[PDB]
Amino acid sequence: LENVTENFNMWKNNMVEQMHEDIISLWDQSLKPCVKLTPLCVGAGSCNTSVITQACPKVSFEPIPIHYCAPAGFAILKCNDKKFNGTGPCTNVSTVQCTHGIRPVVSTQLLLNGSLAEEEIVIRSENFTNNAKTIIVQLNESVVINCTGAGHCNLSKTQWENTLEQIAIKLKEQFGNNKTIIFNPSSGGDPEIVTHSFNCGGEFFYCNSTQLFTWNDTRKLNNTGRNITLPCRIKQIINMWQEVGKAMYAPPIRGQIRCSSNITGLLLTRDGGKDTNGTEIFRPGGGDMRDNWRSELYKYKVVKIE
Amino acid sequence: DIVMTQSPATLSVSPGERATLSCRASESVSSDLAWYQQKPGQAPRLLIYGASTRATGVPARFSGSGSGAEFTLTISSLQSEDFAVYYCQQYNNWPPRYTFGQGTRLEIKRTVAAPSVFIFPPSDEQLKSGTASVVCLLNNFYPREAKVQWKVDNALQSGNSQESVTEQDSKDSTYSLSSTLTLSKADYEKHKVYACEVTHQGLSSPVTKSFNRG
Ligand SMILES: *[C@@H]1O[C@H](CO)[C@@H](O)[C@H](O)[C@H]1NC(C)=O
Numbered sequence A: 001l002e003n004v005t006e007n008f009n010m011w012k013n014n015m016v017e018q019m020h021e022d023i024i025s026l027w028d029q030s031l032k033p034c035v036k037l038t039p040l041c042v043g044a045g046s047c048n049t050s051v052i053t054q055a056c057p058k059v060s061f062e063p064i065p066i067h068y069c070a071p072a073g074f075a076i077l078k079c080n081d082k083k084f085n086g087t088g089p090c091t092n093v094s095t096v097q098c099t100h101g102i103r104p105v106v107s108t109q110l111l112l113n114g115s116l117a118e119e120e121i122v123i124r125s126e127n128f129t130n131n132a133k134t135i136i137v138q139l140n141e142s143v144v145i146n147c148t149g150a151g152h153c154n155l156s157k158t159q160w161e162n163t164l165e166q167i168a169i170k171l172k173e174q175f176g177n178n179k180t181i182i183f184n185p186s187s188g189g190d191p192e193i194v195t196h197s198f199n200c201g202g203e204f205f206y207c208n209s210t211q212l213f214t215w216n217d218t219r220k221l222n223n224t225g226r227n228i229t230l231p232c233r234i235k236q237i238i239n240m241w242q243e244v245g246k247a248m249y250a251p252p253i254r255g256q257i258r259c260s261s262n263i264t265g266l267l268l269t270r271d272g273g274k275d276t277n278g279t280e281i282f283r284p285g286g287g288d289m290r291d292n293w294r295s296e297l298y299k300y301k302v303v304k305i306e
Numbered sequence B: 001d002i003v004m005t006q007s008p009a010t011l012s013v014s015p016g017e018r019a020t021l022s023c024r025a026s027e028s029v030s031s032d033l034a035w036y037q038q039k040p041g042q043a044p045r046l047l048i049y050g051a052s053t054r055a056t057g058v059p060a061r062f063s064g065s066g067s068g069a070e071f072t073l074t075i076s077s078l079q080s081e082d083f084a085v086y087y088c089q090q091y092n093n094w095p096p097r098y099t100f101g102q103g104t105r106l107e108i109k110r111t112v113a114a115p116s117v118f119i120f121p122p123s124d125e126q127l128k129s130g131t132a133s134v135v136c137l138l139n140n141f142y143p144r145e146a147k148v149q150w151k152v153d154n155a156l157q158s159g160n161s162q163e164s165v166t167e168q169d170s171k172d173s174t175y176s177l178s179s180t181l182t183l184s185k186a187d188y189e190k191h192k193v194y195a196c197e198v199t200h201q202g203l204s205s206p207v208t209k210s211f212n213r214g
């Protein structure tokens, strides 16, 4: 550990933007659409769409862990604490060569294969007061989730029920104990944000996460169900996360696509409610892959040599 | 840049029998190959696609075979209605640059029938027009192969004339050529005898049918 006190701000961390831009370029030479459409305006309202048609090679895009080592004239500083807001003065900081192996998983609503919370479930937010700022949840115990191009994902109803609890409890432990915690599905928006979207085998899965976010701080949902089955769908025409615009990928082909990932975290986003009675409603969120990266770099910060 | 060649430019075969068509491709087109069927004067008909899968509502006699650069639309007991030109479509490259085969006529092969040449002189009314048109019909015959020659005053002159075969018929299933030597007024009057020599395969020997102005 480094014997000094420094400031950290994962919400304004620059490595996030440095990885994000990398992960995008890690996408332009691995997953290339058959056609990519992107807004093109002079400002005069009228906006032509810039079209691009390239080969559409079916590649089973399988993410490789990524390290981030400071070159020279630069040093990475890691924060150490069982519960770090990731936005303030860190006491147990410590210089490191490369950040832990991170598997740049691009997804929405659920953070897959990320890094678990050592102690307990932690939830960071650039401002919990602002019903506009994504709440990044960090699970201390991942929940396996298996998706298949066959059309769905299975999740443990047990583990997911617990998780919502040990999350619902960490929420009120920030918005007011004497406050009811509820979970509802997406409010609306793009398919990629409304469902738990992500990529598996180069196939863009779109799983309906209603059964994962319709939890009332009162009842249950395990009648005749041992596992939660999200009705997933693979799309060819998708909205790009790298930049405003659609992109069409070629249909599936491999006799079988399969994924078994660790739900290591979520991206929630409680609704304003305009100071109404203690009844905070949290819904799935994300779509801004940087929050993802953040959830992984929340305790890092590269700095110039002295 | 993909070239799709349908080797059998023409395939003469009889009803009930088995007809085979072969589409040859430049580079590999994998399995993105379809087959079409076109009746004279009709929009094509999607028979097979993806190389070996028949389109919804299509006779099982049509067999789609192949993969790579060698496809085959083989047909078991060919049918009366199965007469048409067949086309293969390549649609595997991307960007989209689909190409079609050049075709194959699935004509009915029958008995070698000789042509009955009818030479028709240019109606005076038509001659009053300013030109003359000598029509040398060739009724009902088979192998569409029928070389015709226009001899003006026993002159092998071969130029101002234009043929026109008809499609395969229904009942007879024969063809009918139609060569037309269109001369002037001052040159039609400048020549005496106008003969039309038909040299068909089913003709024991050349058959010249002509006429003298009058
Ligand atoms: C379309 O977009 C182009 C930008 O390349 C712009 O110059 C043009 O005025 C717009 N109008 C047309 C051609 O549709």
Ligand SMILES: *[C@@H]1O[C@H](CO)[C@@H](O)[C@H](O)[C@H]1NC(C)=O
Pocket (backbone or CB within 6 Å): A119, A120, A121, A122, A140, A141, A166, A167, A170
């Ligand atoms: C954090 O994880 C431990 C087990 O790893 C669990 O017992 C504890 O309750 C969790 N904290 C909560 C409730 O968020």
Ligand SMILES: *[C@@H]1O[C@H](CO)[C@@H](O)[C@H](O)[C@H]1NC(C)=O
Pocket (backbone or CB within 6 Å): A144, A145, A146, A154, A155, A156, A227, A260
């Ligand atoms: C997910 O798949 C793994 C094997 O990779 C299996 O051990 C686990 O039981 C599955 N989880 C489900 C279907 O709940």
Ligand SMILES: *[C@@H]1O[C@H](CO)[C@@H](O)[C@H](O)[C@H]1NC(C)=O
Pocket (backbone or CB within 6 Å): A178, A278
């Ligand atoms: C919750 O608010 C306070 C705790 O700050 C507590 O004393 C009070 O009894 C509770 N009232 C409500 C909102 O039920």
Ligand SMILES: *[C@@H]1O[C@H](CO)[C@@H](O)[C@H](O)[C@H]1NC(C)=O
Pocket (backbone or CB within 6 Å): A194, A195, A208, A209, A210, A211, A231
């Ligand atoms: C699945 O999601 C749709 C909207 O995406 C929702 O309307 C529907 O009721 C959901 N079905 C389930 C599994 O409850």
Ligand SMILES: *[C@@H]1O[C@H](CO)[C@@H](O)[C@H](O)[C@H]1NC(C)=O
Pocket (backbone or CB within 6 Å): A214, A215, A216, A219, A220, A221
């Ligand atoms: C949440 O509560 C509503 C109404 O009380 C109920 O219809 C819904 O099924 C509950 N969510 C689940 C499935 O736990």
Ligand SMILES: *[C@@H]1O[C@H](CO)[C@@H](O)[C@H](O)[C@H]1NC(C)=O
Pocket (backbone or CB within 6 Å): A157, A158, A222, A223, A225, A226, A227
């Ligand atoms: C609810 O269902 C789960 C499996 O889906 C089961 O493990 C659990 O025991 C059930 N609840 C009870 C205690 O009846």
Ligand SMILES: *[C@@H]1O[C@H](CO)[C@@H](O)[C@H](O)[C@H]1NC(C)=O
Pocket (backbone or CB within 6 Å): A142, A144, A145, A260, A261, A262
């Ligand atoms: C990560 O996910 C796999 C896939 O189900 C699971 O089997 C494995 O135990 C998980 N490892 C972790 C991070 O605990």
Ligand SMILES: *[C@@H]1O[C@H](CO)[C@@H](O)[C@H](O)[C@H]1NC(C)=O
Pocket (backbone or CB within 6 Å): A103, A105, A112, A113, A198, A199, A200, A201, A258, A259, A260, A261, A262
């Ligand atoms: C890690 O998560 C990804 C989700 O994109 C999944 O495809 C992969 O299988 C997971 N790791 C394992 C167990 O292979």
Ligand SMILES: *[C@@H]1O[C@H](CO)[C@@H](O)[C@H](O)[C@H]1NC(C)=O
Pocket (backbone or CB within 6 Å): A276, A277
């Ligand atoms: C909270 O519930 C509703 C919110 O719509 C409000 O009308 C009511 O006054 C509040 N308190 C009660 C009655 O629970």
Ligand SMILES: *[C@H]1O[C@H](CO)[C@@H](O)[C@H](O)[C@H]1NC(C)=O
Pocket (backbone or CB within 6 Å): A002, A003, A004, A005, A091, A092
């Ligand atoms: C580390 O311990 C030394 C004791 O001399 C102290 O000067 C320094 O401030 C400490 N650093 C930390 C962890 O704050």
Ligand SMILES: *[C@H]1O[C@H](CO)[C@@H](O)[C@H](O)[C@H]1NC(C)=O
Pocket (backbone or CB within 6 Å): A001, A080, A092
């Ligand atoms: C960081 O240093 C503090 C001060 O002694 C100590 O309490 C804490 O356990 C250390 N954290 C770790 C395990 O790096």
